[PDB]
Design an enzyme around this catalytic site. Sequence first.
Site, PDB file in Angstrom:
ATOM      1  N   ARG A  31       0.486  -0.179  -5.468  1.00 58.69           N
ATOM      2  CA  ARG A  31       0.193  -1.018  -6.648  1.00 58.69           C
ATOM      3  C   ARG A  31       1.221  -2.240  -6.506  1.00 58.69           C
ATOM      4  NH1 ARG A  31       1.083  -0.799 -12.853  1.00 58.69           N
ATOM      5  NH2 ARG A  31      -0.107  -2.507 -13.479  1.00 58.69           N
ATOM      6  N   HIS A  35      -0.017  -6.053  -5.934  1.00 58.83           N
ATOM      7  CA  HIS A  35      -0.102  -7.136  -6.837  1.00 58.83           C
ATOM      8  C   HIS A  35       0.893  -8.103  -6.733  1.00 58.83           C
ATOM      9  CE1 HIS A  35      -2.273  -4.989 -10.644  1.00 58.83           C
ATOM     10  NE2 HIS A  35      -2.775  -5.134  -9.708  1.00 58.83           N
ATOM     11  N   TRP A 175      -8.567   8.779 -10.763  1.00 58.02           N
ATOM     12  CA  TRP A 175     -10.118   8.511 -10.114  1.00 58.02           C
ATOM     13  C   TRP A 175     -10.483   9.813  -9.137  1.00 58.02           C
ATOM     14  CZ3 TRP A 175      -6.041   4.885 -10.602  1.00 58.02           C
ATOM     15  CH2 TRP A 175      -6.483   3.521 -10.991  1.00 58.02           C
TER      16      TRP A 175
HETATM   17  C1  HEM Z   1     -10.725  -5.639  -9.177  1.00 62.20           C
HETATM   18  C2  HEM Z   1      -9.729  -4.929  -8.414  1.00 62.20           C
HETATM   19  C3  HEM Z   1      -8.736  -3.842  -9.150  1.00 62.20           C
HETATM   20  C4  HEM Z   1      -8.877  -3.633 -10.540  1.00 62.20           C
HETATM   21  C5  HEM Z   1      -9.591  -4.269 -11.725  1.00 62.20           C
HETATM   22  C6  HEM Z   1      -7.656  -2.378 -10.506  1.00 62.20           C
HETATM   23  C7  HEM Z   1      -7.297  -2.051 -11.727  1.00 62.20           C
HETATM   24  C8  HEM Z   1      -6.181  -1.086 -12.037  1.00 62.20           C
HETATM   25  C9  HEM Z   1      -5.818  -0.444 -13.272  1.00 62.20           C
HETATM   26  C10 HEM Z   1      -6.581  -0.695 -14.497  1.00 62.20           C
HETATM   27  C11 HEM Z   1      -4.912   0.561 -12.919  1.00 62.20           C
HETATM   28  C12 HEM Z   1      -4.169   1.476 -14.042  1.00 62.20           C
HETATM   29  C13 HEM Z   1      -2.607   1.058 -13.810  1.00 62.20           C
HETATM   30  C14 HEM Z   1      -2.045   1.809 -14.830  1.00 62.20           C
HETATM   31  O1  HEM Z   1      -1.895   1.912 -16.133  1.00 62.20           O
HETATM   32  O2  HEM Z   1      -1.016   2.614 -14.320  1.00 62.20           O
HETATM   33  C15 HEM Z   1      -4.544   0.598 -11.642  1.00 62.20           C
HETATM   34  C16 HEM Z   1      -3.708   1.410 -10.763  1.00 62.20           C
HETATM   35  C17 HEM Z   1      -3.745   1.545  -9.423  1.00 62.20           C
HETATM   36  N1  HEM Z   1      -3.978   0.557  -8.520  1.00 62.20           N
HETATM   37 FE1  HEM Z   1      -5.724  -0.948  -9.016  1.00 62.20          FE
HETATM   38  N2  HEM Z   1      -7.234  -2.240  -9.291  1.00 62.20           N
HETATM   39  C18 HEM Z   1      -8.059  -3.141  -8.449  1.00 62.20           C
HETATM   40  C19 HEM Z   1      -7.886  -3.159  -7.143  1.00 62.20           C
HETATM   41  C20 HEM Z   1      -6.634  -2.282  -6.305  1.00 62.20           C
HETATM   42  C21 HEM Z   1      -6.254  -2.585  -5.038  1.00 62.20           C
HETATM   43  C22 HEM Z   1      -7.042  -3.532  -4.017  1.00 62.20           C
HETATM   44  C23 HEM Z   1      -5.465  -1.772  -4.736  1.00 62.20           C
HETATM   45  C24 HEM Z   1      -4.177  -1.209  -3.400  1.00 62.20           C
HETATM   46  C25 HEM Z   1      -4.940  -1.844  -2.372  1.00 62.20           C
HETATM   47  C26 HEM Z   1      -5.030  -0.964  -5.978  1.00 62.20           C
HETATM   48  C27 HEM Z   1      -4.107   0.102  -5.989  1.00 62.20           C
HETATM   49  C28 HEM Z   1      -3.800   0.736  -7.195  1.00 62.20           C
HETATM   50  C29 HEM Z   1      -3.195   1.994  -7.135  1.00 62.20           C
HETATM   51  C30 HEM Z   1      -2.635   2.599  -5.817  1.00 62.20           C
HETATM   52  C31 HEM Z   1      -2.996   2.590  -8.627  1.00 62.20           C
HETATM   53  C32 HEM Z   1      -2.062   3.799  -9.224  1.00 62.20           C
HETATM   54  C33 HEM Z   1      -0.778   3.195  -9.723  1.00 62.20           C
HETATM   55  C34 HEM Z   1      -0.053   4.561 -10.157  1.00 62.20           C
HETATM   56  O3  HEM Z   1      -0.860   5.481 -10.405  1.00 62.20           O
HETATM   57  O4  HEM Z   1       0.877   4.453 -10.695  1.00 62.20           O
HETATM   58  N3  HEM Z   1      -6.039  -1.239  -7.021  1.00 62.20           N
HETATM   59  N4  HEM Z   1      -5.545  -0.215 -11.053  1.00 62.20           N
HETATM   60 CA   LIG Z   2       2.666 -12.973  -6.233  1.00 61.54          CA
END
Ligand code: HEM
Ligand SMILES: [Ca+2]
Length: 267
Positions: A31, A35, A175
């Site tokens: 993440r 970002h 997920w």
């Molecule tokens: C429209 C696109 C996306 C949305 C709306 C989204 C949204 C989110 C949200 C709401 C979380 C929860 C954060 C938290 O409270 O820990 C999250 C976590 C995460 N995101 Fe996404 N995401 C998107 C795309 C992506 C992409 C492109 C990647 C990487 C290639 C990604 C990788 C991750 C990973 C690995 C986590 C887990 C973080 C953790 O478990 O600490 N996401 N994302």
């Molecule tokens: Ca940046």
Amino acid sequence: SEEPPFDIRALRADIEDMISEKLELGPSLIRLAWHEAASYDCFKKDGSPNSASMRFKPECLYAGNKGLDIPRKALETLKKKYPQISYADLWVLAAYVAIEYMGGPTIPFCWGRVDAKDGSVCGPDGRLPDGSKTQSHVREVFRRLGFNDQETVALIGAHTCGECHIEFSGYHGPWTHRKNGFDNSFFTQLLDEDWVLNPKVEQMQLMDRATTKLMMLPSDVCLLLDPSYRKYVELYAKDNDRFNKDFANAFKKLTELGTRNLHKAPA
Ligand code: HEM
Ligand SMILES: [Ca+2]
Ligand SMILES: [K+]
């Protein structure tokens, strides 16, 4: 190509030590690199992606980057031990290692990323995507970054690992059932399960009718509702290998947005 000024061999190993000592750091590292890159507007050619500009306020304070102070601090232990590497190179590499460590593809690394000197170069807020919105928004965000619908679906496949935390995003849960593994089981969770409303979480998210332990976002499930996106969902859910190829390429492309004068690392 050229040998880097830091010891990447040792570094790759030390990063695995950190992750093995703390598995939830794995997904969190992905993440953080992502970002960092997401601020990019390719049409406007700004945002300053892949420069570790999230080290400084306000970008570190943006709503979309909450809780990313944890992997950043984790990587400080390694910025000291390896002064020669930029923050920007380290966030990216820590993420490649995390993906490989979790069973994902091995991505060729390239180095040479210049760090942002201060927070004067950060991108505007609101560049990061909102999980509460759906495909019109999603397609808007990934278009601005420079990705097509295919690359868009592949990149979101990273939700095969990790979880949401109420105190970070307002959402909650993993997920998939293997939240420390890295494969196509997100497109599979998305396709096989029956995604019913979760009425106990104030921000609208879904859950599996089968066990109710898993979750999906509106932005996740919008990959079903859009016909283009659903094509690539079926594709990646059936073909794990292609998912690894496509994720590796795109995440590499992603983590190289706005970059010039990089060098291929040896292995
Ligand atoms: C429209 C696109 C996306 C949305 C709306 C989204 C949204 C989110 C949200 C709401 C979380 C929860 C954060 C938290 O409270 O820990 C999250 C976590 C995460 N995101 Fe996404 N995401 C998107 C795309 C992506 C992409 C492109 C990647 C990487 C290639 C990604 C990788 C991750 C990973 C690995 C986590 C887990 C973080 C953790 O478990 O600490 N996401 N994302
Ligand atoms: Ca940046
Ligand atoms: K998994």
